[PDB]
Structures are given as C-alpha cells and as structure tokens.
Amino acid sequence: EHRAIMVDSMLHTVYRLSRGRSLTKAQRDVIEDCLMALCRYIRPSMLQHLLRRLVFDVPILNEFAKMPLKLLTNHYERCWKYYCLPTGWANFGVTSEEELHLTRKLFWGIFDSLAHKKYDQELYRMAMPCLCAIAGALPPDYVDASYSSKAEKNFDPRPVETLNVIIPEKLDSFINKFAEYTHEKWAFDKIQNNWSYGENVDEELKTHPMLRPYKTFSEKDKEIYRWPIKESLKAMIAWEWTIEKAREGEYNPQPPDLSGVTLSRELQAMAEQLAENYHNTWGRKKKQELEAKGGGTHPLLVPYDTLTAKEKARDREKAQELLKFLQMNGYAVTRLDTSSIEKRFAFGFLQQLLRWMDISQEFIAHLEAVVSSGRVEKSPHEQEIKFFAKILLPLINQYFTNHCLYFLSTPAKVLGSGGHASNKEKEMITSLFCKLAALVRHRVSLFGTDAPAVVNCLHILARSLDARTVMKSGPEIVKAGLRSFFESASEDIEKMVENLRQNLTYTTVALLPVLTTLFQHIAQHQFGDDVILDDVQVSCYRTLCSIYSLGTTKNTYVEKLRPALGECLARLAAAMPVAFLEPQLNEYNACSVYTTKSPRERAILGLPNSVEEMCPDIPVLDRLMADIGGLAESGARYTEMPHVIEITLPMLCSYLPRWWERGPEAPPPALPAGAPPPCTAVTSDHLNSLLGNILRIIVNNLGIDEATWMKRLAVFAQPIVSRARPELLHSHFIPTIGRLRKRAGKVVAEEEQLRLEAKAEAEEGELLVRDEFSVLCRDLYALYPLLIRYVDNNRAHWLTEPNANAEELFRMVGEIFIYWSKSHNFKREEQNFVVQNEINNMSFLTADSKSVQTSLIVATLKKMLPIGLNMCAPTDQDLIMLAKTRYALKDTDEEVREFLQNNLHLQGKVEGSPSLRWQMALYRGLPGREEDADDPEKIVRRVQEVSAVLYHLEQTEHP
C-alpha cells in the first residue's frame, strides 16, 4: 500500500503484455500465469484500476477475454467478505459503492454477452464459475448509484450533439448567463485563495493571473472557458429533459455550485447521465489523441461510471453541484420514480431471471410441442436451451445457497446478518419457485442431462423462498400460484395412488424430494400455522391420507420408494398445524378449517366437517399407540410390517414431540394466552411410551439381518430421545445393552478361538466374523446414538445424585468398549459399515444435537465416563493410575485383580494431600455416597473396571 501507484502501473503493463500480439503459446502463458499469481497475493483495494480496464472489454467475451475471466473468477471468489459483507474483510477495508458498481456492470455485461453469443462449450464451461463468483461477491442489498443510468453501448465517447442542436431562446439567455457566471465563479475561486484577479498578467497571483469582468474581458476567451458549461446546460436541455426555469428569472459571485439539496430520484439519475455527458464531451477530444497513438486507454477515457472514486467524482460532483445549484437558484429541471425496492440489485436480478423464466417457458413451448414428433431436432431456441439450463440454473443455485439467509430474513425475524428483503422481493422469489415447478411439471424426461441440476436447484429454491409474508399480506397472484401448486401436487399424489395401485418419474425423483424439503423448511420455521390454511391445508389433508393408502399397499413398487414417502409425510406431519392425528379435538384446534369456517363454507369447500370422515384410513394417536404397543409386544418384524416402521412411526414421532409444545404440560406464557385448549392428550407420557416402543422394536428385530431402515429410524427418533422418563433407563436401555454385550462377547470368543484355529480356517472364519461384526456394528450404531442423547439428557442428574443403574450402564458400555479395543476386526468393521452407509455424518449429527475421533463407541464412552469416575473414590484414583501403568504392562485382568488385592495397603492418603482432601470431602458429602464402597471386593472391582476404561481410552487416542 505504500507504493500502490507503481504496482497499479505494473499490473496495467502486465495486462497489456498478456493481451499483446507477437507472443507464442508459452510466451503468453508466462504472462497470464504471472497475472494470476500476482493478483492472488495483492490486496483488493488497489486492483480496482485493473478491474476498470478489465470490465472495459471483458464483455466482448472472446478468446482474448478467456483468461481475464479466469482472473475475475479467482479474484471475486477470493475476496467474498470484502465485497459482500457490510463489515470489511478481515485486516482489510470494505468495498466502495464504486467498486460494487464495477461488480454489477461486469456481471450484467457477461450475462448479456452470454445471452447474445451462440453456445460454445469451451466458452460456457469457464464463463459460469465467473458468474457464480460475481453473484456471490456482489451483496444483494447493494443498490446502484443510479438505477436509470445512461447505459450507453476502445469505445469512442460520442460528444454531445448539442453544439449543433438548436436551443430554445426562452431558455438560451441563462445558458450564456450561467456560463459567464461559472467564469466569474472561477475568478471567485481565485479570490478565495487570497488571489485578487488582476486585469493584466501578474506573477504574484498564483492562480489564473489575467481576469477581468465580462464588460471589458474578451468575449472570445469568455467563450473558451465558458463553452464547456454552455454545452453542459445545452446538453442538459437536449437529452430529453426540461431545464426551463421554475421561476420567472433567468466578476466575483459568492454562491458557488453546490449539491446540498436532494430532489427526485429519476432527476438524480438525469444528473448522473449529465455526468456521463461531461465524460463523453471531454472524452471525444481525449479519444482523438488516444486513437492517434493506438495504445491502451487513458485512465479517465474509460467510462465515468467505471472510474474510481476521485476520477468518477470529477464528473459526478460537477453534475450534482450544477443541477442542485439550478434547484437552489430556482431552476428546477425535470426529465421514472422507480422504488428503491426495484433499485435494489436482488430484486432486478431475480426479475431478470423471471423474464428469462418466461423465455425458458418459450423454449419449452417449442420443445414440448415437438417432443410428440419422433426424432425431432428443430430448435429455434437452441441458444435458450443451452443458456438457461447450462448457466442460469447453477447460477441461481450458487446465489441462493450463498444468500439464502437474506432471502429468508424477515423485517421482524431478522436472520440474515446483512439484512432482510422487501415484501415484493419475498413474494416473487416464491412465484419464481412455483414457475420453476411448472417448468419441471411433466418434464423429467426432457432435459434429462440437466434433470438432476433442475431438481437440486429447485431444492435450493425450495429453501428460503417463504418468509411467511407471501401468505400474510402478500400479492394474491403469487398466493394463488402457490395454492394451485399445492393443489396440483396433491392431485399429483392422487395420481400416484392410481399408478401404484411424465408425472410418475416427475414425482419419484423430483416432486417427492422437493416436497420433503419444502415441508422440512416449513417445520424449521415452525410458523406453518399461518402457511398451511385453506387450499394449502385441504391439499395437505388429502395428501396425508393418500400416502397412507400408499403405505397400506404392499407391492414391491411401493416398497422401493416407501422410505422417501416416509420422510415426506414426517416433514408434513411437522408442518401440519391442524393436529391431524387428533380428530376428536379438531374443534379444540383453532387452525382447522372446521374452526375457521362455517359448516356451509366447509360444505362448499368439500370438507366432511370431521377429520374422522376426512381420514377414515388414519386413526387417532391413541389408536396408533395401541397398535404400536401391540406390535412391539408381539415382536414386530421388518418383513412382517414394513409399512408401520417406515410410515406410521414417522407420523407418531413427528407429531408427538412437536405437539408437546401445544400440549397442556408445556408452560403457557399466561392463563389468558393459554385459554385456547391444547387439543392433545400427548403430554410427556406419550413421548416416553413411543420411545420405549421403538426401543422394543429395535431389540426385537435386532436379530434379523439387512433391515437398513435402522439408520433412518434412529435419526427419526433423534428428537424423541430427549425428554424421556428416567425409569426408561433400567426398563429398556439396560436390558438391550446387556443383550448386545453378551452377543458381542460371544463374537469376541469366536474370534479368539478363531485365532487358536489353523491358518485357512482362521481366514474363512475371519470372513464370517467380519460379516457378524458388521451387523454387530449396525446394531450398535442403531442403539448407541439413542444412548448418547439419553446420557447427555440425564448426565447431570446421575452426577448430582449417583445412580446405581447408571453405574451398571457404565460397566455395560465399558466392557463393550474393551471388546472393541481388543478386537481390531471390530474397529475396521465399524469403519467399513460407516463408509458403506455414510454413517460418518450421522455420528457427527448425533454428537452435535446433544474415523477414530468420530467413533461412536469411544464417543459414548467419553460422554458417560464421569459416571464410573464418580463410582471410584478419590483415594482409589491413585489405585486407578497404578492399575493403568500395570495395564500398560499388558497384564491379564485376573492378575490386575489379584495384584490390586495386594495393593489395597497403599491407597493414597487423602488428608495429607491438599487436593485429595477436598476431593474426598466432596465425594463423601455427595448425598448418595456411602462408606460401604470401602469393602475390598467393591474397591478391586470398581477400580479394575474404571482403570481398564481409562487405559483402553488412552490406548485408543495415542497407543
């Protein structure tokens, strides 16, 4: 930064050499790689000059502009926080609105030049990372300095034609008066420097020496100085504006040209175009010199709007001071009142893809109309097909992914750090999502190469599209569009009911996952109360029963996709605000159309006035708990009832947790606020029983292999492990962990006698126990996440009041852990199962909700090690370490027990050590602690177990 001028000039010269001729491939490669590596380690503050030079001719978008576009997609991706975040990038400053408008001009130039240039594979492959990078760099809330810019076109700045254009004489008197006044005001600027203007040439006058009042001062040189301002006012009247005076009026003047007053926005835009007029009038003569030499471009010959702050100010400040001087002197000029909402980058940009969305509807109108014809190749809009799906679809993908927090931000519910959007910007992104849904409606087969791109971008469009402002005080056009989209999706599911007994492939891979993501997005707001009403609520009403009918059907065609259906119905269950699963208290539920509407209104809406009649297939939550309790008691199997586990359990485990907050046990803010009835009998007992039921079904089907649904059953029960009754520990968690411990111990016994076996027998038995250990790790990864959630829920209680069941669990999970540590086959089968079913993310999800580092067994050991650590006494902690050094001597556990029986005679003294004193004090003052643990049998057992846990854990982390 100390010598930034010469690095600016050096960057300019390197760019000149990179685009210069008479260079071989390697010769130009060296220069372009120098440019790239140079800009890689240069602060983005002084690169705006090179960016001006770059935006001048990169929109040509030719082979010479290939590598500069790569430079742009590196630079703009690198400095994200500098351009986008309102706070400047770390250790650096913040971007100027100047550089931000170069960002905007560059993005628009590449976009329109891509829309003109015919599809080239090489060009479009690299042009699209640049568009994504510029869209990410430019913040959405940014507004251009003038929305209604001149937008003209080595470009030659055309001088204003007002030199020869006639000027009305009703306003030509003040053109002369104002030009003479600016000469006089130049003299006034001279005298403000204590330089009194002299009639003759004087050297003591530092500024313009020779100056006289207009009466005697020569008219020819008056016109020499005054002609630029005379031409500026003549331009300001000639460019479709009216500088005709507001009031009847028309060598040292005190008032100078000032820019204090604000005036209208379109009039500010006209002032900006007047600055453009200054630029082109001065730039014609400078371009005459530039074309005479044929080298580069003068720094200010580049457009005024692309110039930096000072050089753009040399025209902008002049235009503002001239126009506001007119307005102050009573000379208002009027040229259209565009709102700042439309002036925002984001609104105009998504409206631009709205217009190309109707253009994309045009090319699908030429594609769908001819797809009936066999082997058709007529593509009048081939450029549209190869532009939209190629560039614009991942463009909106990346932009929406990196700015979804601002789309989803709300004036009340402020989520985006930068800010929130306007109501119009919120509603037409929803309409864009609906129009893309129509764009993909029945078109899964068409544009098949870009079909995964369409579905993924529509998932990205299916998030941060609803800020609960289109439903609440939104345009009825967009509200009807989304309501008809919901109705069409429900009729579409009604078509899948007939099919299961092109929309089929448009649903199984596109509409169903996007519906899942949409309902999850609704649930993550948890403001579905206002969203799912009227047409939305009726459409989900029938969707719910229709997919329950699909669950009732038992053909392999519905089997193959039933898990996806289950995810979607769970999402809508967490998005449905009617308490669909409580038909008896639907009048208690306020969100129901039965409560909101009259009986006649329900009849004309086609509703049977009762949720019971509305869903004869789906019974009440009490009936479903009776069913699931009976099934768990009878020992349900996955082959026996696949539909229940993958369909109805999502209903129950998505309804009960979310509707506990609506239940009576949840604390209401006040009695008048909670005066509406809770309309549910779930309380917390229903959650507790549901968790017990799934634990019973998992332990009952644990024997049977396959049953891959265990993973998604675990993550579906993720919200239900929280808030469980403490008796569930000894009731279910202890027995199933005991069963798994004894089974795993049998498997390790098989492994040990397998090591004792012969070599080939060892190999074959090793394969079979690899299979057995993989299913063992499957069962562990199905149960132990629930253990992790439960143990983080109730660790504090078990530590404040020691729990014998918790200590028994400690010995249980701990000997499971030592089995894992001794069996190397176990560890690699854990990794194998994790990489087979992508459980590496699931383990981190379980750890965050409440490899060796992400190993689930060592994770649940380190969660609940304090249980056994309370089990052991501080005086016995010394014995713990001693048994640890002994276990590092690789001694057998029977031996560790006998030598510990020897070692009871040197337990560390607690009174002597200051630390052991207070540790013993707290341990003994623990309310549940007794002195019965001083018995030598208990001491040796507990110290052996705990020290084994520590030893194996330290061997796991660092052998």
Partner 1 sequence: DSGSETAFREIEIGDGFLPVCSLGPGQVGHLNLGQDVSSLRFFAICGLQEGFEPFAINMQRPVTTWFSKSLPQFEPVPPEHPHYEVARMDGTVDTP
**Chain positions contacting partner 1, by CB under 8 A:** 795-796, 799-800, 844, 847-848, 866, 869-870, 914-915, 918-919, 921-922, 925-926
Question: Of 755 and 958, which has the nearer Cβ to partner 1?
Answer: 958
- 86/84 Cα distance (integer angstroms): 6
CB of 866 to partner 1, least distance (A): 5
Question: Of 760 and 796, which has the nearer Cβ to partner 1?
Answer: 796
- 55/103 Cα distance (integer angstroms): 9
Three-state SS at 235 = helix
Question: Of 581 and 950, which has the nearer Cβ to partner 1?
Answer: 950
- 125/123 Cα distance (integer angstroms): 6
Taking Cα atoms as reference points, which of 814, 864, 859 lies closest to residue 834? 859
DSSP string, 345-391: HHHHHHHHHHHHHHHHHHHHHHHHHHHTSTT----TTHHHHHHIIII
CB of 919 to partner 1, least distance (A): 8
Residues in Cβ contact with 622 at an 8 Å cutoff, skipping those fewer than 6 apart: 681
Q: 148: how many CB neighbours lie within 10 A of its CB? A: 18
CB of 949 to partner 1, least distance (A): 13
Taking the alpha carbons of 59, 62, 66, 68 in that order, is the dihedral positive or negative? negative
**DSSP run (H or E) holding 941:** helix 936-957
Q: 169: how many CB neighbours lie within 10 A of its CB? A: 8
CB of 914 to partner 1, least distance (A): 6
Question: Of 242 and 800, which has the nearer Cβ to partner 1?
Answer: 800
Taking Cα atoms as reference points, which of 324, 224, 239 lies closest to residue 274? 239
The CA–CA distances, whole Å, from 778 to 82, 207, 536, 704, 782 equal 47, 88, 40, 11, 6
CB of 795 to partner 1, least distance (A): 7
- 277/283 Cα distance (integer angstroms): 10
Question: Of 294 and 914, which has the nearer Cβ to partner 1?
Answer: 914
The CA–CA distances, whole Å, from 402 to 69, 517, 691 equal 21, 18, 38
CB of 134 to partner 1, least distance (A): 28
Three-state SS at 500 = helix
What dihedral do alpha carbons 429, 140, 271, 311 form, nearest 10°?
A: -150
CB of 915 to partner 1, least distance (A): 6
- Give the tokens for residue 636: 């349900």
CB of 883 to partner 1, least distance (A): 17
- 506/492 Cα distance (integer angstroms): 10
Question: Of 453 and 799, which has the nearer Cβ to partner 1?
Answer: 799
CB of 918 to partner 1, least distance (A): 5
Taking Cα atoms as reference points, which of 150, 185, 137, 409 lies closest to residue 304? 150
DSSP string, 772-795: HHHHHHHHHHHHHHHHHHHHHHSH
Question: Of 435 and 884, which has the nearer Cβ to partner 1?
Answer: 884
CB of 144 to partner 1, least distance (A): 35
Q: Which residue has the tokens 């030592």?
A: 818
CB of 409 to partner 1, least distance (A): 19
Question: Of 699 and 834, which has the nearer Cβ to partner 1?
Answer: 834
Q: Check: CB of residue 210 under 8 Å from CB of residue 200.
A: yes
Question: Of 245 and 884, which has the nearer Cβ to partner 1?
Answer: 884
Question: Of 667 and 914, which has the nearer Cβ to partner 1?
Answer: 914
Question: Of 243 and 948, which has the nearer Cβ to partner 1?
Answer: 948
CB of 882 to partner 1, least distance (A): 17
Question: Of 610 and 849, which has the nearer Cβ to partner 1?
Answer: 849
Question: Of 582 and 878, which has the nearer Cβ to partner 1?
Answer: 878
- 826/543 Cα distance (integer angstroms): 45
CB of 851 to partner 1, least distance (A): 13
The CA–CA distances, whole Å, from 907 to 559, 914, 942 equal 63, 16, 14
Question: Of 542 and 862, which has the nearer Cβ to partner 1?
Answer: 862
The CA–CA distances, whole Å, from 558 to 469, 504, 517, 716, 936 equal 37, 12, 20, 20, 62
CB of 208 to partner 1, least distance (A): 41
